[PDB]
Write a protein that binds this DNA or RNA. Structure first.
Ligand SMILES: [Mg+2]
Ligand SMILES: [Mg+2]
Ligand SMILES: [Mg+2]
Ligand SMILES: [Mg+2]
Ligand SMILES: [Mg+2]
Ligand SMILES: [Mg+2]
Ligand SMILES: [Mg+2]
Ligand SMILES: [Mg+2]
Ligand SMILES: [Mg+2]
Ligand SMILES: [Mg+2]
Ligand SMILES: [Mg+2]
Ligand SMILES: [Mg+2]
Ligand SMILES: [Mg+2]
Ligand SMILES: [Mg+2]
Ligand SMILES: [Mg+2]
Ligand SMILES: [Mg+2]
Ligand SMILES: [Mg+2]
Ligand SMILES: [Mg+2]
Ligand SMILES: [Mg+2]
Ligand SMILES: [Mg+2]
Ligand SMILES: [Mg+2]
Ligand SMILES: [Zn+2]
Lengths: 100, 75
RNA sequence: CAGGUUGUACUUCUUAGAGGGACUAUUGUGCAAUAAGCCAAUGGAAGUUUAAGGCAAUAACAGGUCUGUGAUGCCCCUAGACGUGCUCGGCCGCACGCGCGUUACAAUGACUGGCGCAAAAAGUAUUUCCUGUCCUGGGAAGGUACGGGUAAUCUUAUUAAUACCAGUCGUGUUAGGGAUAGUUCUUUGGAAUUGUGGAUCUUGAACGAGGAAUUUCUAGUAAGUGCAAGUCAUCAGCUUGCGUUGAUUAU
RNA sequence: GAUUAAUAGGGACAGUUGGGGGCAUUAGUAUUUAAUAGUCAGAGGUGAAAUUCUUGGAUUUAUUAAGGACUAACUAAUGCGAAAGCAUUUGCCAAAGAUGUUUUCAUUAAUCAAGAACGAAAGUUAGGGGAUCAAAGACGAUCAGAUACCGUCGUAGUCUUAACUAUAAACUAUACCGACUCGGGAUCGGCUGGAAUAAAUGUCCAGUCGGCACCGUAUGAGAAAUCAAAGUCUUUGGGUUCUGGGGGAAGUAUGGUACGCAAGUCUGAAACUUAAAGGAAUUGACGGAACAGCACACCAGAAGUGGAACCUGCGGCUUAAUUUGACUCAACAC
């Protein structure tokens, strides 16, 4: 019973692909296989934002607080446990560009 | 922590701090800890002006090998 | 203010038959993708499916019941019987373990007076069943003196107890609390001893609000408070119901 | 007197294309360490913690330097390589496909016992090197026990010269050359026209050859999962190597003028025993997985039982007998 046709990794036309340590655990995982999400968040709770934006010395800031950039790479056990990715029915299992 | 710092800058006559934020970085995690936000807030909460803000977290062009196993932390 | 009478009288109260009544009604630039529906305010006796119940598909669980059955298969006992009786015990026997529960640890209390507040149930194959007057006894209780009722007629449309009003008692194993005991008296029963219940003096223990745990519960509801019915000759700390006083907190 | 010139194959050549290879170069932060400055009491680490480090000043901050690795992000259902594998700059060296040819050769080809070139990791031999991690080991913790999962350390290893070794789920678990059978966009590399502009190593459009794939679909296949091959198979034959014949025994025994220093590799049995082992899929049940309902389950509360005396059931224990049924809700004031 082949489960995935992909077999989980996006790799074709090559023998080998570089291994990446998982953010959460650090387990080595295939770069194709890895659940990778790029995150641009803000360093600060919106309330905290109000508080700081009061005290910003340079008024020449328009959204003058930096965002936090993360390239987040999960091994499978981790990204499942941690709900980044979750179990779906056989038909949905092949759906490719899902979010909102 | 923050309020102690602020109280002590206040007598050094210091209005404003630039901020350089860091997580352990390098080969370790790049997500700053829980205290990050709280300390940043409590600093300004204490009536301290805030200057330019940068994240300097150590960022390998490339890494030495991670402290985990080959299989990472199990459990 | 109370009785007694009364009528081609009357229906508010009381029976209880017919028929109404509620359909989530009306309104809502309330939420609903404007659909089902939810929500609020108003009206309304009633808007939690009005409230509380009765009934309970398909499938199970070798759940329980040969001790409810003159429903039984099979097995067993069959005359000093495992049949049908009689007499005395026993099931209530106590080092202890575990469940339902009644009563308390008090002042929002206990006790002494006073006080025309219920509901729902029962009831005589004639003296036997509810029992009303009356009388005796200090009392539980006894007479039998006069009586009613197979009951909407008589017990009774009362007789309940929390509650209320006075007064005592004064934060202490105290009258809180009454377990346990010893005399007496009464009642049901041939039979009360291994106290059936009830009465009088005594006697007065634990308990100073409860470890780990854990039950039930959203409105006339919880909780307190008595009353009936089943059992029953006698025996309610049980059950099944009935009202009274009435919440805290969530929809 | 020399057949064509295979949408056969070899060769030439032309502009490209590539994270293919080998040498040199070269960068970049990062880990670790050191130096020089600072400042102070805690750093680490965990579920909590403890081993550790710390006033001889750690962690922390700034600037440099040393030393081994490693090439992030861009990074993809994209590329190259025979596979293993391959990702910093530049230069050099040889090599390659596809495309483009009104070039040349003219069957030179397909597959393949022998025999050969490669071949992750781990491991072995002789030197180097040693920053990070890190088998073994030393410790902390956890636990009934942990010689485990976690933590602090740490050797071999990890890197490198010369050599061995030949093995992996070395995986599309799918042999190679060749035909033929559906549709659709997109993608990487050539080419051919066309169009726009700010006129180009850039766009767009339409062709086409070759790649990696994908999405539909089959009145094709299959036990199915699924498969554009896993189709053109009882309507059974295009060419060629390899492998299997119930399960264990067992990749064991044994033999190897087969290999290896060794580990081991390759070759490789039978006796014996056994009725199934096995493949996909369905429905249940279960889950120390994900989601969603509902109930006084919780929410917010109340009255409390559990503590006391007594009453009344169970169980024990005595008994001549203490008749008996009924033990989680779903026995036990029944
Ligand atoms: Mg591989
Ligand atoms: Mg760690
Ligand atoms: Mg109903
Ligand atoms: Mg049974
Ligand atoms: Mg009398
Ligand atoms: Mg009566
Ligand atoms: Mg006596
Ligand atoms: Mg008594
Ligand atoms: Mg009676
Ligand atoms: Mg009873
Ligand atoms: Mg350096
Ligand atoms: Mg270097
Ligand atoms: Mg590329
Ligand atoms: Mg060596
Ligand atoms: Mg222990
Ligand atoms: Mg270490
Ligand atoms: Mg062109
Ligand atoms: Mg078919
Ligand atoms: Mg076949
Ligand atoms: Mg397909
Ligand atoms: Mg054939
Ligand atoms: Zn992980």
């Amino acid at each position: 019973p082949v489960k995935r046709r992909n077999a989980g990794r996006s790799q074709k036309n090559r023998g080998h692909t570089r291994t990446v340590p998982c953010t959460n655990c650090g387990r080595q995982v295939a770069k194709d296989k890895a659940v990778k999400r790029y995150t641009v968040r803000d360093m600060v709770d919106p309330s905290s934002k109000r508080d700081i934006q009061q005290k910003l010395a340079f008024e020449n800031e328009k959204q003058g607080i930096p965002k936090l950039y993360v390239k987040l790479q999960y091994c499978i056990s981790c990204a499942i446990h941690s709900r980044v990715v979750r179990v779906r029915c056989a038909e949905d299992r092949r759906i490719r560009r899902p979010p909102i | 922590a923050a309020i102690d710092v602020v109280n002590r800058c206040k007598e050094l006559k210091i209005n404003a701090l630039h901020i350089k934020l860091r997580a352990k970085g390098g080969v370790e995690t790049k997500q700053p800890g829980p205290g990050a936000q709280s300390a940043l807030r409590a600093l300004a909460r204490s009536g301290m002006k805030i200057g330019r803000i940068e994240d300097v977290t150590p960022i390998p062009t490339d890494s030495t090998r991670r402290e985990g196993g080959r299989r990472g932390r199990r459990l």
